[PDB]
Design a protein around this nucleic acid. Structure first.
Ligand SMILES: O=C(c1ccc(-n2nnc3cccnc32)cc1)N(c1ncccc1Cl)[C@@H]1CCCNC1
Ligand SMILES: [Mg+2]
Ligand SMILES: [Mg+2]
Ligand SMILES: [Mg+2]
Ligand SMILES: [Mg+2]
Ligand SMILES: [Mg+2]
Ligand SMILES: [Mg+2]
Ligand SMILES: [Mg+2]
Ligand SMILES: [Mg+2]
Ligand SMILES: [Mg+2]
Ligand SMILES: [Mg+2]
Ligand SMILES: [Mg+2]
Ligand SMILES: [Mg+2]
Ligand SMILES: [Mg+2]
Ligand SMILES: [Mg+2]
Ligand SMILES: [Mg+2]
Ligand SMILES: [Mg+2]
Ligand SMILES: [Mg+2]
Ligand SMILES: [Mg+2]
Ligand SMILES: [Mg+2]
Ligand SMILES: [Mg+2]
Ligand SMILES: [Mg+2]
Ligand SMILES: [Mg+2]
Ligand SMILES: [Mg+2]
Ligand SMILES: [Mg+2]
Ligand SMILES: [Mg+2]
Ligand SMILES: [Mg+2]
Ligand SMILES: [Mg+2]
Ligand SMILES: [Mg+2]
Ligand SMILES: [Mg+2]
Ligand SMILES: [Mg+2]
Ligand SMILES: [Mg+2]
Ligand SMILES: [Mg+2]
Ligand SMILES: [Mg+2]
Ligand SMILES: [Mg+2]
Ligand SMILES: [Mg+2]
Ligand SMILES: [Mg+2]
Ligand SMILES: [Mg+2]
Ligand SMILES: [Mg+2]
Ligand SMILES: [Mg+2]
Ligand SMILES: [Mg+2]
Ligand SMILES: [Mg+2]
Ligand SMILES: [Mg+2]
Ligand SMILES: [Mg+2]
Ligand SMILES: [Mg+2]
Ligand SMILES: [Mg+2]
Ligand SMILES: [Mg+2]
Ligand SMILES: [Mg+2]
Ligand SMILES: [Mg+2]
Ligand SMILES: [Mg+2]
Ligand SMILES: [Mg+2]
Ligand SMILES: [Mg+2]
Ligand SMILES: [Mg+2]
Ligand SMILES: [Mg+2]
Ligand SMILES: [Mg+2]
Ligand SMILES: [Mg+2]
Ligand SMILES: [Mg+2]
Ligand SMILES: [Mg+2]
Ligand SMILES: [Zn+2]
Lengths: 58, 50, 39, 135, 127, 104, 103, 84, 122
RNA sequence: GAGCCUUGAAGCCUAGGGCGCGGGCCCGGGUGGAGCCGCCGCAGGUGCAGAUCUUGGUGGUAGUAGCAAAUAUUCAAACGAGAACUUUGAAGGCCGAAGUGGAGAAGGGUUCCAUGUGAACAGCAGUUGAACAUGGGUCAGUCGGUCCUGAGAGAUGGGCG
RNA sequence: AGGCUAAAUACCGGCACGAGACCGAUAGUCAACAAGUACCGUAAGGGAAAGUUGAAAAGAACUUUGAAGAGAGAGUUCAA
RNA sequence: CGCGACCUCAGAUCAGACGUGGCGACCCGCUGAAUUUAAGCAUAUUAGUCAGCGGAGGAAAAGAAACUAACCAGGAUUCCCUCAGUAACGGCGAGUGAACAGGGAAGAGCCCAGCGCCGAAUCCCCGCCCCGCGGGGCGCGGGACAUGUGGCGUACGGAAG
RNA sequence: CGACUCUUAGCGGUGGAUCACUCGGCUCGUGCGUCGAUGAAGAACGCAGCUAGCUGCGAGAAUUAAUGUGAAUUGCAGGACACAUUGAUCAUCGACACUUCGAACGCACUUGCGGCCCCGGGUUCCUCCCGGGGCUACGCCUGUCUGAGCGUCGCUU
């Protein structure tokens, strides 16, 4: 995901749950050199990234 | 310099946002006489200096 | 595009090496050669 | 009296100005005390001041300060002139008792040096060469 | 002769206010006269234009007795476009041709509530 | 003009640096650096001894001459050969000094 | 620098006078301002006359000017007491009161 | 070894972007600013350089509040809203 | 559909909240469409959706501000933004009542010596 | 001046016709596309060869000097309109571990990588590149900053101004 | 040796505003244009060049050489 | 030894309020040169100006005589024409340089300390009602200032009884 | 004879002078005379469907509301075309809102380190635990509270 730079890792970990109703294993972040924040979110081993991608549209 | 403080990355981020040419639908507007980015920057000839 | 790229040199600056170069600076070399001129 | 702040007695000028040790600094010491009190407490307004003591080196003044925004002074309309906002920092524009006496203003033949307002205003009107449409 | 001290005879200021007036003044500038039968019927000299009138051209290359409908109004270009007035390019694509609305005679209006109110204001002021 | 053409700062180069002894702007990179500074014979310098807003514009005339000229102009307006020799059209006009009624 | 038989000139121009030149160009505008101020004063008062306070009869003070006579400032409270009227009542009536004047 | 050989030993910058005027004069080794004078309270300006005033006085930037100061002065600071 | 402020002023804030939630859902889904390819028609829709998001927050703050005024009204010591802004010199002017307040000496002076109307020609 | 002009003014050119002793002018011809002049008065930032004048442009010199520090290339094939330089193979060489290698600090700021173009830029050329255009790439409790004090710098208390 | 106070008065900053025997893009503010912009210097600071198609883009369809630039026909308009 | 009263004092993220920073064309307070002039240069002049610093408003500053004058006397301040390139200053050189009379524009005067008389008759803060809006001002009870001096009457033109 | 060179002239190219135009300057004058702790001037960063500048704006980001206006903006799609609902665009702007630095204010600035109070979830609670909000700069004034003094003094042991 692409996140605004004010948000930290705990707030991303809460926001992904409170929008998509799926757990968060852990969160890596980096500052993409264009200026935004690129956040990798690993899901729980129960869920499916393919199903979540199909249900968010990508 | 491969590790640098955060203000420098915001500055370099806005400069990478600046460094891009003119889209073509602006060139055919009404009353426009802009033909190219005169403010275009090449990384060998001009150095911004932080 | 092809037409945009072919256009792009004709507008792309043409006078950024018109930094003009030839401020030059100071001499201090021609007269250096001490000929002495009647020491 | 004040010592001229140039280092090592070096004026860099004519023999008019080599006098480092002897300058007296026009303003009076009472107005100096008023300036320091006012700009240390710039929230207040300076009314006047007076002498209380001197021994060798230190000279002692007492300065009365009027509060601008207390209600006892914002009422009682004989006093509202200092609450009116043209009197911020009277001591630095020299409107006090010692300030007028330092600026040197009166009436008559002993005061032609400042004919109206101040010596700079007098200098302005005297050396402003005036030119009309018709001459 | 100009008698106000608050309006300009100045050519520079007049051209500048003209070419930089906003859209709700450009409506008043792009105004057309009405035909003489309609000005007899309504007692009004001129009106602003809109998308839906019936329009005859009085001068140009395209002159006379061709009462067509307007379709677009570029207030940016001070130009209306008329449905009959066309010209092909080289590649056989038709394009509308620019007509300034001073060269335009209105034969029918589009009736609407605000147009009735503007028309009644014109008649009441002409008195 | 009323303001400087001396917004630029300038110095000369001297006997060395062959070109001239005009003051020159000091800088680099921007290609005005090394052009002609303030002066008359240069690009973007002040005009010679420039116009000043205290020029003696208005002039005074004596009041007796101001009235004398009015009397002379009214006297010249009475003769027909003078006013036709200015360029008016008085060929089919009645009397010279026209005088209509106060109903006008 | 001088020449043939010509008068000695000492003009006062060595001081940088071209900086501080105040020039009468707003003189007709000030005349119109002061006309509008006087007409505004006349409309803002009432029945009270313009140049409202009356002025005394006063002789100049110089062996040069003492033949003449001048509209003075005020009525010299001794005179105003002989008139039989109070002080500030005269200021309200429009009678000028200047207490420094001696008779 | 005075010119082009000794230019190559330039590696340490002595000016960084100061946080007040953004104009690259924050001299680290004195911990101050050159242009605006940041560790001082008052803003640095001088009469002996007119072009510095011409670059940094008001009117150059947005005046993003001073605009609406003028726009409210043009009516005189109303506090009601309008009638319908 | 269109979300007019005139319609929104009668609403309750708990329904404004849910309506804003639905609008931000539309915002995020059409922004996913903005990232991915096939979105030729949804982009004017994302513009009208974000301008609709602005209106509801405007109505909410318009309600909350005057609802705060309705119970600080008639009170001393109401807060700073609800105090009159105007400008700093107009805050620090005296008062109309302190302006018109007069001492008893000046009052008795005006009572004894009032200003008259007169005229002098005859 | 009931001045002149879209039936063509200003400006420009002219082996054209003339005038004046000249300053200069008038007409003809051609370009040119929207304003111009005569006279009487009036007011000027009012007439160029130069000032190692200023700015802008172009010559002769001249297709000349010059593309020479560090040994060096050759054959075949491929893609291509086009190969002394691109890529692959083979061969011969150099750097020879204090390197023309493998990685970093300061500095640079996207040059990193892929795809496409070869108009300008690479001082020859180029299918190539660090050129241009499109689109990607930098993930840390345990690597470092953050924390500590050093040489020092700096605030309140105080003093001076 | 304590104090207050309008007027007439100065104003090249600002806010709008009106005019001119002023300059007409090497002139006039440095800035008629993306001007305190590009750019130079570590910095104080220095600081440009650059207006004009046509009435209307009607901006050359299509053919035909050439790898393309470029060209020859054709076409637009009063004029390419 | 404890407690109480003050007097000097500190503290607080005490309740409420205020000052800082900017623009600086004009104004106000200080500080303050030098080029140049004098054909040299030291006083003079450039000038109490450029620069520096601190302040302020729509204007500021000034201001109701410890005045001008010397005769038939004027009468706060400000600004203009005159005074005047004068009286005067000056290696009595270069140079510098006022003011009152006069005529105009605008017109405006006032308060307090002191002195004494009135039983502190005065002000601030808190709390309740009072009232009507676009929004805050008089009155009633208790906490303070204040007798080392609130307020009324009072100003050199006399004032009080 | 050709080539070369020279001079004219026609044509063509390089070049951008003259002329003509001007949403620009300069000067004069009138009218007004307004910044900031309720966070100014300035700076940074960000914002459009296609978007780099300029311009305009601030997580409501090419503008929100409201009043007037009355059918568009425009380079191209789309989208609301609704108007016998509320009505496009543009101007006015008085209600909202106003990221970070900046006098900058919790202490410094490296986006670092905090401290209380309060509210939602945590171990259903303090013991250096997540999210959110508020408060936490200096100086000074009026009053409150706390208390120092072999300073002066009383009553008392
Ligand atoms: O390079 C030069 C050099 C030589 C001549 C000129 N000149 N003289 N008149 C001139 C006119 C125009 C241009 N140049 C000119 C300039 C420089 N050198 C040098 N040699 C001898 C004396 C002085 C120098 Cl500096 C170095 C020094 C060490 C040995 N290697 C060479
Ligand atoms: Mg640089
Ligand atoms: Mg005073
Ligand atoms: Mg004369
Ligand atoms: Mg003009
Ligand atoms: Mg000058
Ligand atoms: Mg200068
Ligand atoms: Mg110039
Ligand atoms: Mg001689
Ligand atoms: Mg002499
Ligand atoms: Mg001089
Ligand atoms: Mg034309
Ligand atoms: Mg002629
Ligand atoms: Mg001619
Ligand atoms: Mg001229
Ligand atoms: Mg000349
Ligand atoms: Mg010449
Ligand atoms: Mg000559
Ligand atoms: Mg030459
Ligand atoms: Mg040249
Ligand atoms: Mg050459
Ligand atoms: Mg050779
Ligand atoms: Mg060769
Ligand atoms: Mg070589
Ligand atoms: Mg091949
Ligand atoms: Mg081959
Ligand atoms: Mg090679
Ligand atoms: Mg070897
Ligand atoms: Mg190595
Ligand atoms: Mg090459
Ligand atoms: Mg390739
Ligand atoms: Mg690469
Ligand atoms: Mg590139
Ligand atoms: Mg791990
Ligand atoms: Mg470690
Ligand atoms: Mg220190
Ligand atoms: Mg201190
Ligand atoms: Mg007095
Ligand atoms: Mg006094
Ligand atoms: Mg005044
Ligand atoms: Mg030109
Ligand atoms: Mg210029
Ligand atoms: Mg056109
Ligand atoms: Mg033609
Ligand atoms: Mg000499
Ligand atoms: Mg000398
Ligand atoms: Mg002196
Ligand atoms: Mg100064
Ligand atoms: Mg200040
Ligand atoms: Mg102000
Ligand atoms: Mg007196
Ligand atoms: Mg005389
Ligand atoms: Mg002097
Ligand atoms: Mg030719
Ligand atoms: Mg050119
Ligand atoms: Mg709306
Ligand atoms: Mg700080
Ligand atoms: Mg909080
Ligand atoms: Zn700075």
């Amino acid at each position: 995901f692409i996140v605004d730079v004010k948000a930290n890792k705990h707030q991303i970990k809460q926001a992904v749950k409170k929008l998509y109703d799926i757990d968060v294993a852990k969160v890596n972040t980096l500052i993409r050199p264009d200026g935004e924040k690129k956040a990798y979110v690993r899901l729980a081993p129960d869920y499916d990234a393919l199903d979540v991608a199909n249900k968010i549209g990508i | 310099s491969s590790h640098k403080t955060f203000r420098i990355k915001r500055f370099l981020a806005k400069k990478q946002k600046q460094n891009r040419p003119i889209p073509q639908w602006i060139r055919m507007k009404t009353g426009n006489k802009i033909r190219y980015n005169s403010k275009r920057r090449h990384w060998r000839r001009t150095k911004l200096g932080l | 595009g092809v037409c945009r790229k072919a256009a792009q040199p004709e507008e792309a600056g043409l006078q950024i090496p018109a930094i003009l170069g030839i401020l030059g600076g100071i001499l201090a070399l021609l007269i250096l050669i001490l000929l002495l001129l009647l020491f | 009296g004040r010592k001229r702040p140039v280092p090592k007695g070096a004026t860099y000028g004519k023999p008019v100005h080599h006098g480092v040790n002897q300058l007296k600094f026009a303003r009076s010491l009472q107005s100096v005390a008023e300036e320091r009190a006012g700009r240390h407490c710039g929230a207040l307004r300076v009314l006047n001041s007076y002498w209380v003591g001197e021994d060798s080196t230190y000279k002692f003044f007492e300065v009365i300060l009027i509060d601008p925004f207390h209600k006892a002074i914002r009422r009682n309309p004989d006093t509202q002139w200092i609450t009116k906002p043209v009197h911020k920092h009277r001591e630095m524009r020299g409107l006090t008792s010692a300030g007028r006496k330092s600026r040197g203003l009166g009436k008559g033949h002993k005061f032609h040096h400042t004919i109206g307002g101040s010596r700079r205003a007098a200098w302005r009107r005297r050396n402003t060469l005036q030119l009309h449409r018709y001459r | 002769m100009k008698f106000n001290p608050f309006v300009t005879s100045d050519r520079s200021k007049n051209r500048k206010r003209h070419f930089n007036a906003p859209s709700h003044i450009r409506r008043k500038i792009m105004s057309s006269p009405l035909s003489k039968e309609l000005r007899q019927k309504y007692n009004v000299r001129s009106m602003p234009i809109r998308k839906d009138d019936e329009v005859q051209v009085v001068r140009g290359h395209y002159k006379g007795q061709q009462i067509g409908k307007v379709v677009q109004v570029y207030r940016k270009k001070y130009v209306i476009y008329i449905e009959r007035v066309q010209r092909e390019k080289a590649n056989g694509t038709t394009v509308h041709v620019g007509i300034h609305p001073s060269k335009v005679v209105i034969t029918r209006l589009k009736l609407d509530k605000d147009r009735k109110k503007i028309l009644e204001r014109k008649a009441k002021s002409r008195q | 003009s009323e303001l400087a053409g001396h917004q630029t700062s300038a110095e000369s180069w001297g006997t060395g640096r062959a070109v001239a002894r005009i003051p020159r702007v000091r800088g680099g990179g921007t290609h005005r650096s090394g052009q002609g500074a303030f002066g008359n014979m240069c690009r973007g310098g002040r005009m010679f001894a420039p116009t000043k807003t205290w020029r003696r514009w208005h002039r005074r005339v004596n009041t007796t001459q101001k009235r004398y000229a009015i009397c002379s102009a009214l006297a010249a307006s009475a003769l027909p050969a003078l006013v036709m020799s200015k360029g008016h059209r008085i060929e089919e006009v009645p009397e010279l000094p026209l005088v209509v009624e106060d109903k006008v | 620098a001088p020449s043939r038989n010509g008068m000695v000139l000492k003009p006062h121009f060595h001081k940088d006078w071209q900086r501080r030149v105040a020039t009468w160009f707003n003189q007709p505008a000030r005349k119109i301002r002061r006309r509008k101020a006087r007409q505004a004063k006349a409309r803002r008062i009432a029945p009270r006359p313009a140049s409202g306070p009356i002025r005394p009869i006063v002789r100049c003070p110089t062996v040069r000017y003492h033949t003449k006579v001048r509209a003075g400032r005020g009525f010299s409270l001794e005179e105003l007491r002989v008139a039989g009227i109070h002080k500030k009542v005269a200021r309200t009536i429009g009678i000028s009161v200047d207490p420094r004047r001696r008779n | 070894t005075k010119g082009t050989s000794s230019f190559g030993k330039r590696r340490n910058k002595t000016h960084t972007l100061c946080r007040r005027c953004g104009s690259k004069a924050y001299h680290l080794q004195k911990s101050t600013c050159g242009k605006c004078g940041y560790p001082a309270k008052r803003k640095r300006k001088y009469n002996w350089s007119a072009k510095a005033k011409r670059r940094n006085t008001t009117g150059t930037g947005r005046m993003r509040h001073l605009k609406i100061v003028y726009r409210r002065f043009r009516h005189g600071f109303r506090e009601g809203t309008t009638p319908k | 559909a269109k979300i007019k402020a005139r319609d929104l002023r009668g609403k309750k804030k708990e329904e404004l909240l849910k309506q804003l939630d639905d609008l931000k859902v539309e915002l995020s889904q059409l922004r996913v469409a903005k990232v991915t390819g096939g979105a030729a028609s949804k982009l004017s829709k994302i513009r009208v959706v974000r301008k609709s998001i602005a209106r509801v927050l405007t109505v909410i703050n318009q309600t909350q501000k005057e609802n705060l005024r309705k119970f600080y009204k008639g009170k001393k010591y109401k807060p700073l933004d609800l105090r009159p802004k105007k400008t700093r010199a107009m805050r620090r002017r005296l008062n109309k009542h302190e302006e018109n307040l007069k001492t008893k000496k000046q009052q008795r002076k005006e009572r004894l010596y009032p200003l008259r109307k007169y005229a002098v020609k005859a």
